[PDB]
Design a protein around this ligand. Structure first.
Ligand SMILES: COc1cc2c(cc1-c1c(C)noc1C)ncc1[nH]c(=O)n([C@H](C)c3ccccn3)c12
Length: 127
């Protein structure tokens, strides 16, 4: 089984803007999650070939990872902070769907999600 192409991280036809919330998502939320000791499996797309998971992309149809989210933020791909937050949620949800409760990767995702939610709770009001 082949890996799909990674999610799109740039599109020159999409409009671009800077907002304080998007800045916070990059400078605070992503920065904090990236350095967490359990972040490493979430820092790039799931390579189902190398991990030998032939059913991964049969089960997960909307893949997402923090490497892709990082690239989207740096490319000004997101217009709304909500789009970025949705991508984080998709990343966590995908992990919980593919894997089983109590699995190592699930416990790792749960730790990251807790931290994510703590940082999103301090998302500044739109300027
Ligand atoms: C056991 O799950 C993974 C293990 C990964 C991974 C992605 C996943 C993963 C994620 C994330 N969501 O579904 C899967 C499957 N990406 C890279 C990577 N490098 C790497 O060595 N792993 C192993 C197998 C690992 C790490 C942590 C916990 C359990 N197993 C992994």
């Amino acid at each position: 089984s082949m890996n799909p192409p990674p999610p799109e991280t740039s599109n020159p036809n999409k409009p671009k803007r800077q907002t304080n919330q998007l800045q916070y998502l990059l400078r605070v939320v992503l920065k904090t999650l990236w350095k967490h000791q359990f972040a490493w499996p979430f820092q790039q797309p799931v390579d189902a070939v190398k991990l030998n998971l032939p059913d991964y992309y049969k089960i997960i149809k909307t893949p997402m990872d923090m490497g892709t989210i990082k690239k989207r933020l740096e490319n000004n791909y997101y217009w709304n902070a909500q789009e970025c937050i949705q991508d984080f949620n998709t990343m966590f949800t995908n992990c919980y769907i593919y894997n089983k409760p109590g699995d190592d990767i699930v416990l790792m995702a749960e730790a990251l999600e807790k931290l994510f939610l703590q940082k999103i709770n301090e998302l500044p009001t739109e300027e």
